[PDB]
Structures are given as structure tokens and as C-alpha cells.
Design a binder for this molecule. Structure first.
Ligand SMILES: [Zn+2]
Ligand SMILES: [Zn+2]
Ligand SMILES: [Zn+2]
Ligand SMILES: [Zn+2]
Lengths: 48, 49, 23, 68, 49, 261, 157
């Protein structure tokens, strides 16, 4: 609602567990090369 | 879009974020995106008000 | 100043430092 | 003679925004001007926010911000 | 007499430098960020005391 | 020394005890840029200061004493400084040693560091003019200060003589009953600047009086800069002192040409 | 990799449960320091910002002395603390240098922030400041720096 202010990040958002993001279930035999890193924030970022 | 190409200029060396970074009045950190969105809504509400 | 002196003068501070106050 | 930018704590930003909720004091007279002069740059700030939006496969995204 | 060729160049380069210093004053004073694209200390005072 | 340099300055007001930064409501909506109230009819908007300076009590050493601060704490004069001994500015009545430090600086700005202006404010309030070295205060608004006590015509002058004597050396004190106002002239401009912000919006109640619980309901007394004194009994004294100032300067000035030659 | 315990976040290594009650005490002080305590003074408002830079320093000294000084935690724990932002990667990296042992924060050595090309004055040794004020015949005028309230970071004192 427009009357209520935007609730602060830290009193409300930061403490709660986030949720389950959208992910395909995957096949461990078909998708084994990508299944570890496909849903990273930046995939393969640390892999030299 | 393909018919009328607008080519960028090469002398555009001053970007906005980079020139603001050189100033002592801007500091840098990493926060969550949803925090950065709510900060911008509170900042933008103050700017108009 | 000597190292034994500076070791002694840094114990004058009320806190441990860097926020320990000479005052 | 260039060292890079110093990477402040996240709480240092956080208190400042909490502090400027009610600028009733006389001390905020320059900082009110800084709100008002920042309005022309706000449009750029909306772009950098929306282009960095978390995609549906991400719970939370930690972005690197530059603040006044 | 017409002005000599060495005389017009002494007056052109004095005037051209004065004009270009004025234009660079106008572009730098404008609040457009896209105007630095198109562009004194240790003074003595008190009889250099 | 014994009253001032002996102790350290004390915290006058706790920081929670400070007043709210928003003013008392005289309007419908509060304006955020200009920290005032907008859709309102009018208001007297002047109120009695809840705080006051006890000079022999609150004075003491501060941080600016060790730092060599030239300027006095404006809130110390209002009785409102919450920093106490941690404050950057001075916390004592100005002395001849202090004003001698301010001698190069007093010409353009007051003892509190605030810059003076070209001409006076219209009502003769505010900071002051650098064109005139005014050392005389106009003590006005005494009726609301006393909370409408009659008292005497001249017991009013006793309270004015009592309070302003704590704030520095006095040239003279004149009270005018028909105009219901006082004229206090100080030895130094710096004391007059200090006593002006010290005594703005104050009360003269003296606790023993019966209205001391209702010192807050009243108006408060205006301390404003004073105009020139219109009687020729005083006018001739001005050109006499201006003569004597000129003779003391020429002796100082021919010594400059002596060193110049 | 974030601060928030996400599902992409990696579970903690072995030695973390021993140091977790110490780290929570820094964490609850940072929640109370950001509490928006409305203070109308400029001298008090930044003074509360000085508490935050102190607690971020003191949490990072703690993890610094666990790993480099006393060797009390493993490297697999210590890298997990940096990726989960419990410690400052770049501030600890200055404490390993010789002149920067007791560094105040990263901001007080940035040469571009200042009007001169200088560090903050809290980098200057106290005995040097006492010597320069002695020649002037005054006490030293510096008490607390404007960036984070330091009182001297110099490794000699
Ligand atoms: Zn004070
Ligand atoms: Zn420091
Ligand atoms: Zn620092
Ligand atoms: Zn500093």
C-alpha cells in the first residue's frame, strides 16, 4: 500500500531464509558436466 | 536498427561512474541487490520530496 | 626515542589502540 | 600514486541512509542540496539497478555499489 | 599600406588564443558533462613577502 | 583561574535532554526543506528559553583551551552545550587576555565566529554590522520576561544590573521606564556579543519569586543591538572618545612612518 | 560467497563452532550501531559512524590473530571467512606489510581523498606530532580523525 513506507532491509528481509529459486531438476547422467556450476551466480568464476 | 547505424565515438573517455569514483565524496561497498533496490526507493522518494 | 620507551609510551593509552586515547 | 578504492563496510552505508530519514536538523542543509543535485543522476542509477537484477535461478545477488 | 603578412599573423595568433581561451571558459562552466570533450599558482603577494 | 582554569567545563544539557529539532507546530504540514510549518495562519513563534547559563558554575577548561581556540561556544552562552569538556570552542566569559587574541579577528566577525554583515538587520537584531563597533545592547521585551509583574520601575533595573554584570565588564547601564527598556554598554564588543546571545529569550524571575514555576509560559526578553544615543549629553561624549581614539592611533601611526622613514 | 546463508553458500568448515560466539558478539553490536539513534549534532552523528569502522576493524583483528598470529584456525576455515565477508580481505592484506601493522582502515591511507597527496594524520606517529607541537609551544591539536575516529595507527605506537 502507498501509505506504508518501504520496510527496511535489516529489520525484515535480512534475517529470513530466502526461498527456493527456480531450478530444473536435472539428470545426473545426462547433465553431469554442468550440474555443479549451472546455477551459480557467476558460473565458473573461480575456475582458472 | 540495421538500416541506420549509430556509431559510437572514440573520444568518450569520461564515463559517469568512473569520474565519480575519483572523487573523495563517493565510497564503494558490496551489498545485496534487494537492499540496493530499497535504498534507491528511499533515496528517490527523498529526492522528489 | 628508543624501542623500550615507545613500548612504554604505547601502554599509556587508555584503550589498546588504534582507538586508545592519549588524553 | 594511485591506490584503488577502499571498499567500505556494508554497515557504513546502512547507517547513513538510516540517519537521513528525518533531516530536521540544521546540519543537513548541505546534505539536502546533495539530495537535490543527485536527481539528474538518478536515471542512470535506475539502469544500473535494473540491468543487474537477479535472474530466476538466483536467490540473492550481492552487487557492488558506489554511494555518496 | 595593407598590413604585412608578418603583421596579420602576429594579430591572428594573439586573437585566436584569446578566443579559444574564451570558448574553453564557456564549455567548462556549462554543467554538461559532454563539454570537456571539446576543449597560474605560486603567485607573489605583499611585494613578494 | 580559581573560578575558571581550576575546573573543567561540565555538560550543561544531556544530549537526550536537548530540545526537538522541529519547532512547535504553527501550521498544518511540516516543510522538509525549510524546517518550518507551512499551511498556518501566524504565530508569535517566540518562547522562553528553557536553559540558562550559570556563569561561575558552568565555566571550565575545554578541548579548545588546549587547542588554542579563539572562539566561544555559542551554546555555552545559551546554556545548551551538550559536549561539555569535549567541545571545540571556549566555555567562559571573555577576558582581556581573550579579546587580545581576538583583536585581529573581531573586526569582521563576532566572538562566536559568525560573520558580521554590511548593514544591520531591520529590527536591529541578529549578529551585527562590521561598519560600526557597537558595544551597547538594547534590552527590550521586559514585560513578558517578568511574566507581567509590576515589581517597581527601578527593581527592574536591579535584575538587569545583576545578570549582565556576570557576563563581562560594563561601561554603563541605563534604564528607561517610559519606554520600558534598558541600555547596557560593555567595555568590549566581545562581551556585548556574548551577552546578547546569552540573554536572548531569557527571563528575570529570580527563583524566590512566586512565578518561578511559570517562567516557561511567558515570552522572553529581546536583546537587540542598540541605536545611537540621541541626547547631546551623550553625543559630545562620543566625539570626545573618538578624539581620544584618534590621538592614541596617531602616536601609533607616526611610529610606523618612523620605522618606514 | 554472499553474507546471506543462501543455497549457493558453502557450509562452514570444522573450526567455526569454536569461534562463533565471539563473532556473534561483533555481529549484534553492528546491529545496534546502525540503529538510527537520532542525534542532531554533526559531531555526534559521525561519532556514531566511528563506532562502525571500529567494530569492522575489531572483527577483522580477531580473525587476523586467529590465522596469522596464533595459527588457531585452518586455511579452509580462513578462506571461508573471507568469502563469507566476516573479515576484510584488503584490510588484513595491509596488516601483513611492515609499516601498516596496526592500520586504522583502508580509507586513511588513500592519497586521493585528501586535499594534499597525503595520508590521514592518524597515520603519523604520536612522538612526531608531539615534537612539532613542542616547537610551536602548544599542545597537539589532533584528537580523532574525521574518517573513522582513529587516534593513531602508526605501528610504532
Ligand atoms: Zn560547547
Ligand atoms: Zn587511524
Ligand atoms: Zn581510518
Ligand atoms: Zn584517520
Amino acid at each position: 500500500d502507498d501509505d506504508e513506507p518501504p520496510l527496511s532491509y535489516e529489520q525484515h528481509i535480512e534475517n529470513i531464509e530466502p526461498l527456493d529459486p527456480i531450478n530444473l531438476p536435472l539428470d545426473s547422467q545426462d547433465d553431469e558436466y554442468v550440474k555443479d556450476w549451472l546455477y551459480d551466480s557467476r558460473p565458473l568464476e573461480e575456475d582458472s | 536498427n540495421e538500416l541506420h547505424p549509430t556509431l559510437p565515438t572514440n573520444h568518450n573517455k569520461t564515463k559517469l561512474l568512473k569520474s565519480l569514483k575519483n572523487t573523495k565524496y563517493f565510497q564503494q561497498t558490496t551489498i545485496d541487490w534487494v537492499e540496493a533496490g530499497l535504498q534507491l526507493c528511499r533515496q528517490g522518494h527523498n529526492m522528489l520530496n | 626515542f628508543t624501542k623500550s620507551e615507545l613500548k612504554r609510551r604505547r601502554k599509556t593509552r587508555k584503550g589498546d589502540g588504534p582507538w586508545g586515547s592519549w588524553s | 600514486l594511485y591506490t584503488p578504492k577502499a571498499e567500505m563496510p556494508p554497515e557504513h552505508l546502512r547507517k547513513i541512509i538510516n540517519t537521513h530519514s528525518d533531516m530536521a536538523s540544521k546540519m543537513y542543509n548541505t546534505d539536502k542540496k546533495a539530495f537535490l543535485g543527485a536527481l539528474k543522476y538518478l536515471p542512470h542509477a535506475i539502469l544500473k539497478l535494473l540491468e543487474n537484477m537477479p535472474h530466476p535461478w538466483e536467490q540473492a545477488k550481492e552487487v557492488k555499489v558506489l554511494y555518496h | 599600406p595593407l598590413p604585412t603578412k608578418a603583421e596579420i599573423q602576429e594579430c591572428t595568433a594573439r586573437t585566436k588564443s584569446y578566443i579559444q581561451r574564451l570558448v574553453n571558459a564557456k564549455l567548462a562552466n556549462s554543467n554538461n558533462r559532454a563539454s570537456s570533450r571539446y576543449v597560474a599558482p605560486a603567485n607573489l603577494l605583499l611585494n613578494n613577502s | 583561574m580559581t573560578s575558571w582554569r581550576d575546573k573543567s567545563a561540565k555538560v550543561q544539557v544531556k544530549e537526550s535532554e536537548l530540545p526537538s529539532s522541529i519547532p512547535a507546530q504553527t501550521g498544518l504540514t511540516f516543510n522538509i526543506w525549510y524546517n518550518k510549518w507551512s499551511q498556518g495562519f501566524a504565530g508569535n513563534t517566540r518562547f522562553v528559553s528553557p536553559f540558562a547559563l550559570q556563569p561561575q558554575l558552568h565555566s571550565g577548561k575545554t578541548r579548545g583551551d588546549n587547542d588554542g581556540q579563539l572562539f566561544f561556544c555559542l551554546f555555552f552562552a545559551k546554556g545548551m552545550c551538550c559536549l561539555g569538556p569535549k567541545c571545540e570552542y571556549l566555555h567562559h566569559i571573555p577576558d582581556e587576555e581573550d579579546i587580545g587574541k581576538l583583536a585581529l579577528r573581531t573586526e569582521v566577525l563576532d566572538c562566536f565566529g559568525r560573520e558580521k554583515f554590511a548593514d544591520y538587520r531591520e529590527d536591529m537584531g541578529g549578529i551585527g554590522s562590521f561598519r560600526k563597533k557597537n558595544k551597547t545592547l538594547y534590552v527590550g521585551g521586559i514585560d513578558g520576561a517578568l511574566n507581567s509583574k509590576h515589581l517597581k520601575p527601578a527593581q527592574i533595573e536591579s535584575r538587569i544590573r545583576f545578570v549582565f554584570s556576570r557576563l563581562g565588564d560594563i561601561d554603563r547601564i541605563r534604564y528607561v521606564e517610559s519606554k520600558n527598556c534598558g541600555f547596557v554598554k560593555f567595555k568590549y564588543q566581545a562581551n556585548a556579543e556574548f551577552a546578547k546571545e546569552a540573554m536572548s529569550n531569557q527571563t528575570l524571575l529570580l527563583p524566590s519569586d512566586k512565578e518561578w514555576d511559570d517562567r516557561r509560559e511567558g515570552t522572553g526578553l529581546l536583546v537587540k543591538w542598540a541605536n545611537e544615543d540621541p541626547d547631546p549629553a551623550a553625543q559630545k561624549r562620543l566625539q570626545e572618545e573618538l578624539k581620544l581614539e584618534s590621538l592614541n592611533m596617531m602616536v601609533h601611526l607616526i611610529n610606523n612612518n618612523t620605522n618606514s622613514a | 560467497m554472499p553474507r546471506i546463508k543462501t543455497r549457493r553458500s558453502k557450509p562452514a568448515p570444522d573450526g567455526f563452532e569454536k569461534i562463533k560466539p565471539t563473532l556473534t558478539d561483533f555481529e549484534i553490536q553492528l546491529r545496534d550501531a546502525q540503529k538510527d539513534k537520532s542525534s542532531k549534532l554533526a559531531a555526534k552523528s559521525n561519532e556514531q559512524l566511528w563506532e562502525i569502522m571500529q567494530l569492522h576493524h575489531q572483527r577483522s583483528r580477531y580473525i587476523y590473530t586467529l590465522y596469522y598470529k596464533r595459527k588457531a584456525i585452518s586455511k579452509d576455515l580462513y578462506d571461508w571467512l573471507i568469502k563469507e565477508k566476516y573479515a576484510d580481505k584488503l584490510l588484513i592484506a595491509k596488516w601483513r606489510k611492515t609499516g601498516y601493522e596496526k592500520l586504522c582502515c583502508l580509507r586513511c591511507i588513500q592519497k586521493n581523498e585528501t586535499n594534499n597527496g597525503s595520508t590521514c594524520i592518524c597515520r603519523v606517529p604520536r612522538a612526531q606530532l608531539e615534537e612539532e607541537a613542542r616547537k610551536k609551544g602548544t599542545q597537539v591539536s589532533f584528537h580523532q580523525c574525521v574518517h573513522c575516529g582513529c587516534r593513531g595507527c602508526a605501528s610504532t605506537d
